[PDB]
């Protein structure tokens, strides 16, 4: 009340952190970092609860202190560091370069990308204005800021950003006909192609997207993330990429029963 | 009869709000007088046996009900409490410690006893039922 809060109750944790209700009174509060602490997956919830590498809040530390975790091309030790979207969690030694992608149910998935594809990432772009001494800068959506950007780059764009030599390799503008993945709300994790953008003077830029399998859905100007030019994404999607409503999930379970086992 | 306009929600709500007061139970509960009763909105109470009395049962009955005049310790009010289970007036003595409860009709006289709304449940920390059935002895 008189200041900041350093505790996060388990029942107050974000939903995509599927945490057992009777597992404790507290959840790991995400540290300050590049991502918004509600759309992030802390490292504690990576070496635990997603991989069986660590078993407690004592071996996550025991393997972070060995400097074994390299997120976004940099060794990180803070166990509650907020890896939030498409961050390259590159585990050295064993080589587990993982892109944090959005499951069709709003979850977080560690898509195992190849090593040479793990040397870059992509970032969404916030406003672009003039800095001190009249030097334009980028100010992406994951805390990153890049000075001297190419003048074609504008707001809401996406940039393919290198890691070892941090410079913009190329970029995709925000326009209709581009692959887009939704990263917020109920439509999280659904890829599609923008059909038209509707503009309301004052607020609420609404984007209408067409799914590959024929479905259509709308969302805000936020929560969307351009992925690739035209209809070809620049990254490997985890699987499915379609909403897959409950009935067809039941059908998949049925055919899994009727095949494979089939007995 | 009734106001059936779609724009007449306030009239219906206000009319029902006014007319709830004719209800006996609603007026009993929402007038706040239940706090001025001896129990002051409590299920049981505790008291000191001031004296042992008998009241003649109302007509057409004919008997002597062994009550007890007691004084509550929480507010000092003096009330008469019935003593059931024949022979249980002997267990009660003077200036004794008793636990009193309501009689059953929620602030109304029960049976032929004139103006008695309480019954003795415990005496000296022992239930009248246990003493009556010889399960326990008065300390």
């Amino acid at each position: 009340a008189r200041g900041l809060k350093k505790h996060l109750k388990r029942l107050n944790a974000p939903s995509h952190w599927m945490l057992d209700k009777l597992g404790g009174a507290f959840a790991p509060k995400p540290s300050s970092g590049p991502h918004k602490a509600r759309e992030c997956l802390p490292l504690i919830l990576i070496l635990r609860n997603r991989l069986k590498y660590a078993l407690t809040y004592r071996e996550v530390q025991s393997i972070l202190m060995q400097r074994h975790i390299m997120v976004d091309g940099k060794v990180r030790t803070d166990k509650t560091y907020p890896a939030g979207f498409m961050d390259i969690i590159s585990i050295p030694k064993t080589g587990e370069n993982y892109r944090l992608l959005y499951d069709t149910k709003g979850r977080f998935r560690l898509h195992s990308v190849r090593d040479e594809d793990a040397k870059f990432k992509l970032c969404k772009v916030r406003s672009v204005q003039f800095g001190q001494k009249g030097i334009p800068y980028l100010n992406t959506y994951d805390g990153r800021t890049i000075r001297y950007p190419d003048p074609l780059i504008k707001a809401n764009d996406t940039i393919k950003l290198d890691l070892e030599t941090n410079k913009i390799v190329d970029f995709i503008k925000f326009d209709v006909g581009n692959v887009v993945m939704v990263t917020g709300g109920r439509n999280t994790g659904r890829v599609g192609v923008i059909k038209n953008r509707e503009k309301h003077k004052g607020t609420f830029e609404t984007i209408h997207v067409e799914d590959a399998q024929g479905h259509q859905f709308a969302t805000r100007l936020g929560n969307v993330f351009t992925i690739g030019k035209g209809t070809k994404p620049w990254v490997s999607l985890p699987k499915g990429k379609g909403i897959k409503l409950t009935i067809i999930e039941e059908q998949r379970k049925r055919d899994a029963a009727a095949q494979a086992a089939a007995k | 009869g009734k106001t059936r306009g779609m724009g007449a929600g306030r009239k219906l709500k206000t009319h029902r709000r006014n007319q709830r007061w004719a209800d006996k139970a609603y007026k009993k509960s929402h007038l706040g007088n239940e706090w001025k009763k001896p129990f002051a909105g409590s299920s049981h109470a505790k008291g000191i046996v001031l004296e042992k009395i008998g009241i003649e049962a109302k007509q057409p009955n004919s008997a002597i009900r062994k009550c007890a005049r007691v004084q509550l310790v929480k507010n000092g009010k003096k009330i008469a409490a019935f003593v059931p289970n024949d022979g249980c007036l002997n267990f009660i003595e003077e200036n004794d410690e008793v636990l009193i409860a309501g009689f059953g009709r929620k602030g109304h006289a029960v049976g032929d006893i004139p103006g008695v709304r309480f019954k003795v449940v415990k005496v000296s920390g022992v239930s009248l039922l246990a003493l009556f059935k010889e399960k326990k002895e008065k300390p």
Binding site: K201, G202 | G5, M6, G7, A8, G9, R10, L12, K13
Partner: protein, 152 residues
């Protein structure tokens, strides 16, 4: 003139003593000029605000106040004030148990610039701004006189 107080009233950052000419200089309010801006949201700046001599720092068009937030339409309730009116916002509250509507209202104090002529019962459109007084949080953006919208 517009100077009716014990201090000179001027538009901030508008130099009124430049020797070089004007009437052709962009951003009105340069080299000596009335400063005015479009509030956006599809609202037209009145001619009485561009070609005006009044000074009002709380005016949305020629002042330091920007319109953002909520836009509310209503009717003028009382205009007995100095550049401030009361707007009555009538609506219907849904009594759920009886599934019926009851008429409700709410007074909203708004600041009206000297470019808008108003009368009691006029139809006003106002927009939320930063607090300007204890109760004023809206600025009048459009005024339509009562008994209007004619022509067929």
């Amino acid at each position: 003139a517009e100077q009716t107080e014990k201090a000179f009233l001027k538009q901030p950052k508008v130099f009124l003593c430049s020797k070089k000419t004007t009437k052709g200089n962009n951003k009105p309010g340069k080299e000596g000029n009335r400063f005015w801006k479009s509030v956006g949201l599809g609202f037209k700046t009145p001619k009485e605000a561009i070609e005006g001599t009044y000074i009002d720092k709380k005016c949305p068009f020629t002042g330091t106040v920007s319109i953002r937030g909520r836009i509310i339409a209503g009717t003028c309730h009382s205009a007995k004030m100095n550049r401030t009116i009361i707007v009555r916002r009538n609506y219907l509250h849904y009594v759920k148990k009886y599934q019926r509507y009851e008429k409700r209202h709410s007074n909203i104090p708004a600041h009206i610039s000297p470019c808008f002529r108003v009368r009691e019962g006029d139809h006003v459109i106002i927009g939320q701004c930063r607090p300007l007084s204890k109760t004023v949080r809206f600025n009048v953006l459009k005024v339509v006189p009562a008994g209007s919208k004619s022509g067929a």
